[PDB]
Design a protein around this ligand. Sequence first.
Ligand code: K48
Ligand code: K48
Ligand code: CL
Ligand code: CL
Ligand code: MG
Ligand code: MG
Ligand code: MG
Ligand code: MG
Lengths: 12, 12, 231, 231
Amino acid sequence: KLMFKTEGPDSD
Amino acid sequence: KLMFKTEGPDSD
Amino acid sequence: GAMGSMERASLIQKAKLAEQAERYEDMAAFMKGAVEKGEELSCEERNLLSVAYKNVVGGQRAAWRVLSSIEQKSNEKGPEVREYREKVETELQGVCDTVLGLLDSHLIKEAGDAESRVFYLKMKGDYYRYLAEVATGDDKKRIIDSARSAYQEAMDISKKEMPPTNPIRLGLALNFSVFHYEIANSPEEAISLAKTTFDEAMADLHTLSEDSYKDSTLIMQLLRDNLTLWT
Amino acid sequence: GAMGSMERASLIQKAKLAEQAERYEDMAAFMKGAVEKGEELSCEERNLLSVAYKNVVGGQRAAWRVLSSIEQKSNEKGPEVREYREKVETELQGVCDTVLGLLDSHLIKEAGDAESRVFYLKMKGDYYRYLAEVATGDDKKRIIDSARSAYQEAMDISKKEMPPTNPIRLGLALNFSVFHYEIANSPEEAISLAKTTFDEAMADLHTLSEDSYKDSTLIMQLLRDNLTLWT
Ligand SMILES: N=C(N)c1cc(-c2ccccc2)c(N)s1
Ligand SMILES: N=C(N)c1cc(-c2ccccc2)c(N)s1
Ligand SMILES: [Cl-]
Ligand SMILES: [Cl-]
Ligand SMILES: [Mg+2]
Ligand SMILES: [Mg+2]
Ligand SMILES: [Mg+2]
Ligand SMILES: [Mg+2]
């Protein structure tokens, strides 16, 4: 899935 | 520490 | 809890060590122990708590998506794909429930300053959002509304009490916009929120020091990244 | 064990899913369950077992080194660094003991073909080597000799029963050479083993298909990488 930017560590 | 190459996944 | 015998300061110290070692499950357990001492958290401690659980749940979310994709393909081999996706899903839900439990007992109710209260309400919205990503049953609408309600309360406080460049306010708006886009199926609301947030921050950058400017523009760029994909 | 009620084939299937999801602790638990069914493992299953535990112990080794470095600097702040390094060390030792336990009960004794027996004896050497990396007490010499003994038995079989390009033989020699260099403090033995292994494989590449050539040269390049750093 295309994941959009959210706050903090991009840990997924 | 400098780690040398060992077999398989370089998981460390 | 299993951290009940360790000093609060030692738990914080070990959370920082665990972060350096990339041991995020340990980091989260140490920070849970610190919260359960019952004292309020400082700004640095709140960030340790959030970073720890964000890394843990992030691994679970990525694994869940891999398994969900395999499962969906298999439905276009037995019960094993569904069983294992369910196993990961249940652990992910457990982590979210743990975080929500810490927020409800009793971080939010003791948080009176905007910086702490908005931070915790944003986290509440985030972990309900992660629950919503995996929800399919008769509670999905209620999970979505719980996320919405927490984000909305955080937004209302942030707009009254923080400047438009405040990084907490910016990251909240970023996340609420993503909630709108793909959880609430409100892409227009997401785009409007991201644009307004970006533009109001832009207009306030002139008030900031060089260091605060860097902090705010970093999150502004995330808003822009999403707007570029959405428009 | 907790996997006792799951079918062997389902455990293997779920180990492969866990690998795709980068859930290596799960992958290792599933493969441990598969081993405990008591049947011998196929080549693919042995590789799943090894990949799973290699990823788990790799995370532990990397974390241990970070903490050990911090601890050493602090000795040139209280007990917390030592305590946490010890916690990670104990978990790492537990994983190594688990793997060694599977090999001793009863993978090695049932392994009669060279490809299986060498594979398992190499693993035995590897996990004693990981124990040796963290060992400091009165058993360190015995741990080192256990690693040496397992690697030596694997080497003796591999030289009698496998061609010099066999990837199992190559990876064994690679790892035994690293054992020599930095566990046994025998850098000359390490260099000699790596060179001889590389040169004897070189001379046998002409016998291989394109696909086997790729497999063998990949490991040969690791030997070369080490020789470049060592000479
Ligand atoms: N350990 C981390 N990943 C972070 C620490 C802090 C911090 C906050 C206030 C003071 C000092 C550090 C962040 N903003 S993130
Ligand atoms: N899952 C993995 N990381 C591997 C699978 C195999 C394999 C061995 C024999 C047949 C098919 C696959 C490896 N050599 S590694
Ligand atoms: Cl399962
Ligand atoms: Cl500890
Ligand atoms: Mg105390
Ligand atoms: Mg479920
Ligand atoms: Mg059966
Ligand atoms: Mg110890």
